[PDB]
Structure 1
Amino acid sequence: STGSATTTPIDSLDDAYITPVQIGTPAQTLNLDFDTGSSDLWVFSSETTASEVDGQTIYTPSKSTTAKLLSGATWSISYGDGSSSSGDVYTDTVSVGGLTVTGQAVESAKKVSSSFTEDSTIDGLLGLAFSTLNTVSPTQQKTFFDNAKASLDSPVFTADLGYHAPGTYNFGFIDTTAYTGSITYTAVSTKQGFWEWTSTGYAVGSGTFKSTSIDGIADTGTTLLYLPATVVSAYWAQVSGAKSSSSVGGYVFPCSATLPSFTFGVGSARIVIPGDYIDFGPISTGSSSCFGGIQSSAGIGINIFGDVALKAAFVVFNGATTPTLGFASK
């Protein structure tokens, strides 16, 4: 089997991408944030504290003839950005882009943190990291991809995120029309439960490529590119007037600037992030200070190849017995 679904930016900055997911019978379609950095499929629901729902579409298990309470199971998650959610668990039928899993754990939120409430466009998350990170207790549950894997034509999924435009998540096949050149594959460590890999270096604009190993995770659920402070300083030094602002929370730059590109290495291959992809707009409405899309990972504890990086590539998440990642230009 295969599946294919379009993923759409939630706003004009590509702050996140939402993909429609069918849950239950009859289907209830919720728009979920597909997150290769976590492993829970959780949704706003009829059980979510009412004051914490503000415009989201909710899953109502009592209206699904295939929903079954997973007796005794609870979940609770905290994300790298300080947000969190928790609740109980049902199993139900879940379909993405024509690919159906029966008996998928659907984690129903009883509580969500304020950042989720305040974002009316995201109805939940669909985790695509390794199932070892799933938070359900006392019986850990499998991700959608893990449940689907054995049925797929090939045990892979691909992320093809758009710049200021929709993109595609495919399951079970590699669309050879969706990229240019060849796909370069690179080793993955699953020791932390993430799609963790080692970039071979970077360049700023037209500058020379610096060969250096940069360990990090491929994370579709993180907006920006978070790299070591040395690398990030080298980037912003090429933008007149750019500086790190402690009060804003990162590097800012004059909105009048033209940003240079940023290149990262995948083996001997190179992925080029155009400068425009690094512009996240005014820090507040009407400001002439703009927020940068490349930020320091110091204090986060891991480097993160988030959407800024991934949207410059066609990315293969190869879930074979020994997982690997593939990157192609597009």
Structure 2
Amino acid sequence: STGSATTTPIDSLDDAYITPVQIGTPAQTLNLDFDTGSSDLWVFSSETTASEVDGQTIYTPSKSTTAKLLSGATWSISYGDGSSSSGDVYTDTVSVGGLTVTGQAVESAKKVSSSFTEDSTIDGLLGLAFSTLNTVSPTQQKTFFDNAKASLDSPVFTADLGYHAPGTYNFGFIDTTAYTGSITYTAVSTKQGFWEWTSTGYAVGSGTFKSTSIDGIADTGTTLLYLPATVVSAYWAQVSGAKSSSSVGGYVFPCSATLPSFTFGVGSARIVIPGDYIDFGPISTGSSSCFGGIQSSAGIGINIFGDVALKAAFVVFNGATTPTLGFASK
């Protein structure tokens, strides 16, 4: 089997991407944030605290003929940005882009933190990291991908995120028309439950490539590119007037600037992030200070190749017995 679904930016800044997901019978379509940095499929639901729902589409398991309470199971998750959610668990039929899994754990939110409530466009998350991170207790549950894997033509999914435009998540096949040149594959460590890999270095604008190992995670659920402070300082030093602002919470730059590109290494290959991808616009409406899309990972504890980096590439998440990551230009 295979599946193919379009993923769409939630706003003009590509803060996140939503992908329609069919849950239950008859289908209830929710727009989920596919997140390769976590491993829970959770949804706004008929059980969600009413005051914590503000425009989201909800899953109502009582209206699904295939829903079954997973008795005794609870979940609770906290994300790197400080947001969180928790609740109980049903199993139900879940389909993404024509690919159907029966018996998928669908985690129903009883509580969500304010950042979720305030984002009316995201109806939940679909985790695509390794199932060892799944938070369901006392019986850990598998991700949608893990459940689908054995039925897929090839044990892979791909992320092809657009810049200010829709893109695609494919399951079970590599669309050889969706990228240019070759795909370069690189080793993954699953020791922390993430798609963790080592970049071979970086360049700023037209500058020389610095060969240096940068361990980080491929994370579709994180907006920005978080790298070591040395790397990030070298980037922003090439933008006149750019500075790190403790008050704002990172590097800002004059909105009048033209941003240089940023290149990262994948083995001997190079992925170029255009400067425009690094612009996240005014810090507040009408401000001439703009927020940078490359930020320091210091105090996160991990480097994160988020959407800013991934949307510059066609990315293969290879879930074969020995997992790997592939990157191509597009």
TM-score category by the smaller chain?
A: over 0.9
Find the aligned partners of 2:115 and 2:13 in 1 and give their Cα distance.
17
Q: Identify the residue that residue 33 of structure 2 maps to in structure 1.
A: 33
Q: Displacement of 1:67 after TM fit?
A: 0.1
CA RMSD of aligned residues (A): 0.1
Q: Displacement of 1:291 after TM fit?
A: 0.1
Q: Encode CA deviations 1:51-92: one digit per residue, 9 max, x unaligned.
A: 000000000000000000000000000000000000000000
Q: How many corresponding residue pairs?
A: 330
TM-score normalised over the length of structure 1: 1.00
Structure 1 residue runs of 5 or longer lacking an equivalent are: none
Find the aligned partners of 1:81 and 1:172 in 2 and give their Cα distance.
31
Find the aligned partners of 2:221 and 2:55 in 1 and give their Cα distance.
21
Q: Displacement of 1:323 after TM fit?
A: 0.1
SS in structure 2 of the partner of residue 149 of structure 1: helix
Q: Displacement of 1:45 after TM fit?
A: 0.1
Find the aligned partners of 1:276 and 1:17 in 2 and give their Cα distance.
18
Ranges of 4+ aligned residues in structure 1 off by more than 6 Å: none
Q: Displacement of 1:94 after TM fit?
A: 0.0
Find the aligned partners of 2:125 and 2:285 in 1 and give their Cα distance.
28
**Percent identity of equivalent pairs:** 100
Find the aligned partners of 1:300 and 1:314 in 2 and give their Cα distance.
26
TM-score normalised over the length of structure 2: 1.00
Find the aligned partners of 1:259 and 1:191 in 2 and give their Cα distance.
36
Q: Displacement of 1:106 after TM fit?
A: 0.0
Q: Displacement of 1:160 after TM fit?
A: 0.1
Find the aligned partners of 1:262 and 1:274 in 2 and give their Cα distance.
7
Q: Encode CA deviations 1:264-294: one digit per residue, 9 max, x unaligned.
A: 0000000000000000000000000000000
Q: Displacement of 1:23 after TM fit?
A: 0.1
Q: Displacement of 1:246 after TM fit?
A: 0.2
Q: Displacement of 1:227 after TM fit?
A: 0.0
Find the aligned partners of 1:80 and 1:287 in 2 and give their Cα distance.
27
Q: Encode CA deviations 1:280-317: one digit per residue, 9 max, x unaligned.
A: 00000000000000000000000000000000000000
Q: Displacement of 1:96 after TM fit?
A: 0.1
Q: Encode CA deviations 1:117-173: one digit per residue, 9 max, x unaligned.
A: 000000000000000000000000000000000000000000000000000000000
Find the aligned partners of 1:177 and 1:98 in 2 and give their Cα distance.
20
Find the aligned partners of 2:21 and 2:259 in 1 and give their Cα distance.
36
Q: Displacement of 1:205 after TM fit?
A: 0.0
SS in structure 2 of the partner of residue 181 of structure 1: coil
Structure 2 residue runs of 5 or longer lacking an equivalent are: none
Find the aligned partners of 2:86 and 2:263 in 1 and give their Cα distance.
38
Find the aligned partners of 1:302 and 1:55 in 2 and give their Cα distance.
33
